[PDB]
Each structure stands twice: as C-alpha cells, then as structure tokens.
C-alpha cells in the first residue's frame, strides 16, 4: 500500500493545515522507510 | 554498528523517570518473590 506519495511529495501542508491520510486493507512494508536520507530521527512510543 | 549509535543500532536500556505527578497506574511498585522447594531434605528452615 502506498507510502511513496505521502513521503515523496512535492508540496506539503502547513502546520495549522496538517495533512491527513488513512491507510487500510493493505500490506505495510516498513523496511523501505530507510533511504529517506543519511541521518534522520526515528522514535516510536508504545511498541518496539 | 562498530559500537556507535545510529539507525538499527539501539542501546538496549531504557529509563522510567518517575515523578510524583503521574496517574495512579504508573507509579513504581516494589516487588519481592519468595521461592520454596518442598521436597525430602534435612529441612533447614521452618516456623514456630
């Protein structure tokens, strides 16, 4: 399911108009969330 | 990870940071566990 267009997006949204998306009925591959760049912050609360 | 922090290189310890202000279900608790072994032996220990 598409995470490319929500990350490789040309135009983003303002802080007061923070952009919403809902994802359901898909398979999520959270490994290809690695080459966004050298050095980025990845913190998650609740699960390992 | 050559012994340095980074992505996929996480230090396997975490902290609590207890403050008097959190909710009733988050304060520290003190736990002690007593283990016995009821078998055949010289019976070193028992009560009054």
From Swiss-Prot, chain B:
Superkingdom of origin organism: Viruses
Disulfide bridge positions per record: 1-9
Function summary: Attaches the virion to the cell membrane by interacting with host receptor, initiating the infection. The major receptor is host ACE2. When S2/S2' has been cleaved, binding to the receptor triggers direct fusion at the cell membrane. When S2/S2' has not been cleaved, binding to the receptor results in internalization of the virus by endocytosis using host TFRC and GRM2 and leading to fusion of the virion membrane with the host endosomal membrane. Alternatively, may use NRP1/NRP2 and integrin as entry receptors.
Subunit structure: Binds to host ACE2. RBD also interacts with the N-linked glycan on 'Asn-90' of ACE2. Cleavage of S generates a polybasic C-terminal sequence on S1 that binds to host Neuropilin-1 (NRP1) and Neuropilin-2 (NRP2) receptors. Interacts with host integrin alpha-5/beta-1 (ITGA5:ITGB1) and with ACE2 in complex with integrin alpha-5/beta-1 (ITGA5:ITGB1). May interact via cytoplasmic c-terminus with M protein. May interact (via N-terminus) with host bilirubin and biliverdin, thereby preventing antibody binding to the SARS-CoV-2 spike NTD via an allosteric mechanism.
Protein name stated in the entry: Spike protein S1
Organism name: Severe acute respiratory syndrome coronavirus 2 (2019-nCoV)
Lineage: Viruses, Riboviria, Orthornavirae, Pisuviricota, Pisoniviricetes
Gene encoding the protein: S
């Amino acid at each position: 399911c598409p995470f490319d267009e929500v990350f490789n997006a040309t135009r983003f949204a303002s802080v007061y108009a923070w952009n919403r998306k809902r994802i359901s009925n898909c398979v999520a591959d959270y490994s290809v969330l690695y080459n966004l760049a050298p050095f980025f912050t990845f913190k998650c609360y609740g699960v390992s | 990870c050559n012994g340095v922090a980074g992505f996929n290189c996480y230090f396997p310890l975490r902290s609590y940071s207890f403050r008097p202000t959190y909710g009733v279900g988050h304060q520290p608790y003190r736990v002690v566990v007593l283990s016995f072994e009821l078998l055949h032996a010289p019976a070193t220990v028992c009560g009054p």
